[PDB]
Amino acid sequence: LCFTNVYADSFVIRGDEVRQIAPGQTGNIADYNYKLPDDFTGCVIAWN
Amino acid sequence: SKFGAISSVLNDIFSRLDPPEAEVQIDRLITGRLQSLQTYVTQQLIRAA
């Protein structure tokens, strides 16, 4: 594929808290620290 | 009519589902109601003829 632009965001969160990193989710991370668009297109990559 | 959705009340499904999951059920409801309106329009056209 081809993309007009790519943005790489990074941060450190709890292991069980990665569930909150997804479109339209609710919670501490999903609301007050990092929120993704509901129609977000991209990839989320996490590891311990 | 539920049209296969968990509930026919949109606020209910909005409250009890996340947007990713609520979208599919809202699409089902939208399709059902649009089809009902299409059928009503077709029947009205036949009656008008």
**CB–CB contact A22 B20 (8 Å):** yes
Q: What is the resolution of this structure in A?
A: 2.7
Name every chain A residue with its beta carbon within 8 A of the beta carbon of B18.
24-26
Confirm if B35 and B11 have CB atoms less than 8 A apart. Answer: no
**CA-based torsion, A9, A12, A13, A19: positive or negative:** positive
Structure tokens at B10: 């949109």
Q: Is A44 on the interface with B (CB under 8 A)?
A: no
Structure tokens at A18: 């990665």
What single DSSP character describes residue B3?
A: T
Q: Closest Cα partner for A30 from A18, A40, A15, A41? A: A18
CA distances from A34 to A1, A5, A31, B3 (A): 27, 20, 6, 35
Long-range CB contacts (within 8 A, 24+) of A7-16: A9/A34, A15/A48
CA distance B29 to chain A (A): 20
